[PDB]
């Protein structure tokens, strides 16, 4: 089960609803016996920009700096910037990771985007040989608790912004699941700036109620990596048998693997698929 | 037509292909009579974090800081941080804006994400009353020129990463088109790290060739805001009449407006739709 939790918050104001939601999760989990650690990016004045400075020492090839290779090497040899390592330790010690943030330009705040870029270093957070379900964080679970200015209807299939499931895909599949994370249902609190005070109090309590049993939840469905030929040769394309079999399925496997057919309803919002 | 172009680069190395793509684009554009301005985020050591320091004036509500409102107010009264103002001036002058960046965790680099967050302030880059096609930059055109580590097949409908069209959606529709921009087909350069020297040279020539007539291209398709009842009362939902003409249609309208049906092939990569 789950015993330790990491709450990554990306909001500058201690007076925001996001901070309240972070406080609610901390209280709720602790009161349930969990150990809670925080990564309040702004309060920590976190540096989100990847650079050659992330490697405390000489680079393998300063004449042509390539961050991927250099950062992985620094990782292996233990030359990663201290601030990066400290976060990597929080990740390794955590069973549950909660990402609390306000949706910004249909994605995560830049400070958090940068946190992934500098913290999710190769070898540590992933390998091309163990992508997705086989990733390093397979024993861990992640959840996005998001707040927005736009109303839920704006994000429905007929809303002007379009399906929220598409917006979540690059984050939940491309970032979290790629590293092995079992991704749980996102906590979506729409139009928080247009919500009555009593309703907000209920949102907080609802979030705490869910956290009581968060670890017994069934995670989102992503196509298993066993359906693909995971080698540079086949170009990591679906196995031909799976393709043929899939040809007789009404729905695609997920948002990203829609295969040109109907995307399973709320594939990135609701579990059981 | 268009004589003014802005190239926003998000890469720290002068030795990268990304920098090469930036030079090639500028060289080719100037050759066709364009005026070319640049925003090399790293070279500028651009601040990517939105904070109350983006406002130089006295806040309207200092004890309860709210970025959306305060920033919009600062734009309206001329109290925005001068570095943000400098970027906004480049945007207003530009006819064509090119975003050159390496794909990082299925999105734009944090430094570029922060650029959108601090520079695309309300009123300046958008207004709820005139979202999408009615936005401020509707007389402008934007293009994403991306380079990736992974091969094209990994991003095909059956590649492990999933459809690249889904990854592109939140940036091209949510950020670019939301502000009125006509978005042109993205220049996609896959597995740049695994491309032979002679091929890389051809990729650059091909990019210069495309830019020779970039302004006359058909842009990508996004559902017009006219298909929606644009008011907090109708939940910014698609017009009932429009919803009825589609129930018979096979394909959805776009990636975000797939409507539970099939997404039009390469909706976010190829024009004509
Ligand atoms: C750069 C940028 C980009 C954005 N892009 C998007 C986008 O793409 N899509 C979109 O939909 N939105 C977008 N937004 C809007 C953003 O998502 C919302 O402004 C944000 O989620 C609002 O929540 P908040 O917690 O940050 O803060 P706040 O606006 O402060 O709101 C929290 C509310 O709850 C109250 N409150 C605070 N603490 C408590 C407590 N303990 N108990 C009860 N009530 C409390 C506050 O007084 C306030 O009214 C963007 C905003 C910015 C700045
Ligand atoms: C934090 C992070 C996250 C990432 N996330 C992803 C992801 O989600 N998906 C993904 O697919 N990839 C990802 N990548 C990989 C990234 O997309 C590639 O490393 C990048 O696109 C490579 O291009 P480059 O221009 O930066 O540099 P380089 O790797 O240097 O490659 C350019 C190549 O062209 C050569 N070259 C330079 N100038 C010229 C010239 N003028 N003419 C001809 N050849 C030239 C160089 O020597 C080099 O071999 C990530 C990388 C990082 C650091
Ligand atoms: C996608 C681009 C980035 N932006 C936004 C889009 C919205 O649709 C929106 C916002 C806000 C916040 O400014 C509210 C909002 C805020 C308060 C109360 C009600 C709605 N709404 C509906 C945005 O910021
Ligand atoms: C980990 C984040 C999610 N993304 C990546 C996914 C890939 O599939 C990938 C990367 C790289 C770059 O590290 C190369 C690559 C690099 C050099 C040569 C060949 C492939 N490939 C195939 C990534 O960075």
From Swiss-Prot, chains A, B:
Question: What does this gene product do?
Answer: Flavin-containing quinone reductase that catalyzes two-electron reduction of quinones to hydroquinones using either NADH or NADPH as electron donors. In a ping-pong kinetic mechanism, the electrons are sequentially transferred from NAD(P)H to flavin cofactor and then from reduced flavin to the quinone, bypassing the formation of semiquinone and reactive oxygen species. Regulates cellular redox state primarily through quinone detoxification. Reduces components of plasma membrane redox system such as coenzyme Q and vitamin quinones, producing antioxidant hydroquinone forms.
Q: Where in the cell is it found?
A: Cytoplasm, Cytosol
Record EC number:
1.6.5.2
InterPro entries for this protein: Flavodoxin_fold, Flavoprotein-like_sf, NAD(P)H_dehydrogenase_qn
Taken from the UniProt record, the cysteine pairs bridged by disulfide bonds within this chain are: none
What biological-process terms (Gene Ontology) are attached?
cell redox homeostasis; cellular response to oxidative stress; innate immune response; negative regulation of ferroptosis; negative regulation of protein catabolic process; nitric oxide biosynthetic process; protein catabolic process; protein polyubiquitination
CC cofactor: FAD
* Regulation of activity: Inhibited by dicoumarol.
Q: Where is this region: Important for apoenzyme conformational stability?
A: 224-273
**Binding positions (substrate):** 125-127
Molecular function terms, GO-annotated: cytochrome-b5 reductase activity, acting on NAD(P)H; identical protein binding; NAD(P)H dehydrogenase (quinone) activity; NADH:ubiquinone reductase (non-electrogenic) activity; NADPH dehydrogenase (quinone) activity; RNA binding
Q: Which gene encodes it?
A: NQO1
Cite the binding residues for FAD.
Answer: 11, 17-18, 66, 103-106, 147-150, 155, 200
Q: What UniProt keywords apply to this chain's record, in alphabetical order?
A: Cytoplasm, FAD, Flavoprotein, Isopeptide bond, NAD, NADP, Oxidoreductase, Phosphoprotein, Ubl conjugation
A Pfam family: Flavodoxin_2
Protein name per the record: NAD(P)H dehydrogenase [quinone] 1
- Locate the Phosphoserine modifications and list their residues: 81
Report where the covalent cross-link Glycyl lysine isopeptide (Lys-Gly) (interchain with G-Cter in SUMO2) sits: 249-250
Q: Name one GO cellular component term.
A: cytoplasm
Q: How does it assemble?
A: Homodimer. Interacts with PDLIM4 isoform 2; this interaction stabilizes PDLIM4 isoform 2 in response to oxidative stress and protects it from ubiquitin-independent degradation by the core 20S proteasome. Interacts with TP73 (via SAM domain); this interaction is NADH-dependent, stabilizes TP73 in response to oxidative stress and protects it from ubiquitin-independent degradation by the 20S proteasome. Interacts with TP53; this interaction is NADH-dependent, stabilizes TP53 in response to oxidative stress and protects it from ubiquitin-independent degradation by the 20S proteasome.
Q: Which family does it belong to?
A: Belongs to the NAD(P)H dehydrogenase (quinone) family.
Record's note on what induces expression: By dioxin. By oxidative stress.
